[PDB]
């Protein structure tokens, strides 16, 4: 039952009420699992982010345990910090670092990123994934919507609600978890999968940054997932515009066989990332500056 689930979740979250120390909630976004708000810390005026997920409106309710446990006390410069989690009525609230620059999705849909900028984003995400994967954490929802920015162009990975933990005893997952257009073929094909699925999804995000949208985006999700499952790796619509370096980099991400797909640690040494600009190079892309 719902109440049986609520009781269990209460045991894992932090005690108390964030409505006692936060106010002035402003909804600024919505995702598959819930909404994201800006809130003000009453004592200081500091802005934080709060995501709110309705326990009754999840495709898979049990996934709500994952982020609140796995990412508790996690600190990395390219990962959005989670501060606390709470059960507030029928909603899970997660209080997090506020990334005032917004998400990469606005950028890929309204601008044309150059390769210095694309390399900067990939380097930041790969730095994050290399450390996460080494600890057995799989993100499972890598896409532009999950990449957030600071006002000065620093890049941080967020949206860990679909994440998973693997171990020496249980090295792979089986759940069909992710966002259709970005899902790895072996995940779609129910091969016990590992961290490698994030590397495929990153490749699809590179397609977003080059083309503006992922492959098969005009198709229904189920149809698209079948095409991802059955067809050869997807091609860039704008292939003729990209450097040999970017194409070679992308060829190591969008490898159909997980065992031959590059790992995050390997990709950090790839020549394409030599093109990466500093945070300043990203700043002109954000809505408030263009």
Curated annotation (Swiss-Prot):
The active site is at 141 (proton acceptor). Highest expression in prostate, testis and colon. Autophosphorylated on serine residues when activated by CDC42/p21. Phosphorylated on tyrosine residues upon stimulation of FGFR2. Methylated by SETD6. Transmembrane segments: none annotated. The modification Phosphoserine is found at residue 175. Changing residue 146 to N: Approximately 30-fold increased autophosphorylation (constitutively active mutant). Residues 22-273 form the Protein kinase domain. It is found in: Cytoplasm. Residues 1-24 are annotated as: GEF-interaction domain (GID). ATP binds at residues 28-36, 51, 97-99, 159-161. Interacts with FGFR2 and GRB2. Interacts tightly with GTP-bound but not GDP-bound CDC42/p21 and weakly with RAC1. Interacts with INKA1. Interacts with SH3RF2. Interacts with RHOU and PAXI; the PAK4-RHOU complex protects RHOU from ubiquitination and acts as a scaffold to suppport paxillin/PAXI phosphorylation. Serine/threonine-protein kinase that plays a role in a variety of different signaling pathways including cytoskeleton regulation, cell adhesion turnover, cell migration, growth, proliferation or cell survival. Activation by various effectors including growth factor receptors or active CDC42 and RAC1 results in a conformational change and a subsequent autophosphorylation on several serine and/or threonine residues. Phosphorylates and inactivates the protein phosphatase SSH1, leading to increased inhibitory phosphorylation of the actin binding/depolymerizing factor cofilin. Belongs to the protein kinase superfamily. STE Ser/Thr protein kinase family. STE20 subfamily. This is Serine/threonine-protein kinase PAK 4.
């Amino acid at each position: 039952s719902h109440e049986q689930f609520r009781a269990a979740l209460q045991l894992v979250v932090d005690p108390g009420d964030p409505r006692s120390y936060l106010d002035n909630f402003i909804k600024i976004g919505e995702g598959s699992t819930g909404i994201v708000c800006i809130a003000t810390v009453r004592s200081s005026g500091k802005l934080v982010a709060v995501k709110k997920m309705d326990l009754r409106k999840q495709q898979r309710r049990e996934l709500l345990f994952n982020e609140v446990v796995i990412m508790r006390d996690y600190q990395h410069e390219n990962v959005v910090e989670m501060y606390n989690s709470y059960l507030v009525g029928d909603e899970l609230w997660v209080v997090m670092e506020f990334l005032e620059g917004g998400a990469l999705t606005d950028i890929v849909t309204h601008t044309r990123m150059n390769e210095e900028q694309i390399a900067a984003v990939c380097l930041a995400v790969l730095q994050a994934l290399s450390v996460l994967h080494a600890q057995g954490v799989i993100h499972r929802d890598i896409k532009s919507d999950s990449i957030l920015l600071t006002h000065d162009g620093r890049v941080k990975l967020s949206d860990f609600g679909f994440c998973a933990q693997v171990s020496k005893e249980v090295p792979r997952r089986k759940s069909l978890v992710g966002t259709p257009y970005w899902m790895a073929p072996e995940l779609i094909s129910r091969l016990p999968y590992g961290p490698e699925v994030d590397i495929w999804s990153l490749g699809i995000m590179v397609i977003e940054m080059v083309d503006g949208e992922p492959p098969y985006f005009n198709e229904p999700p189920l149809k698209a997932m079948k095409m991802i499952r059955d067809n050869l790796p997807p091609r860039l619509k704008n292939l003729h515009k990209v450097s040999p370096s970017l194409k070679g980099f992308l060829d190591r991400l969008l490898v159909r066989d997980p065992a031959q797909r590059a790992t995050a640690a390997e990709l950090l040494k790839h020549p394409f990332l030599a093109k990466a600009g500093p945070p300043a190079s990203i700043v002109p892309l954000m809505r408030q500056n263009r």
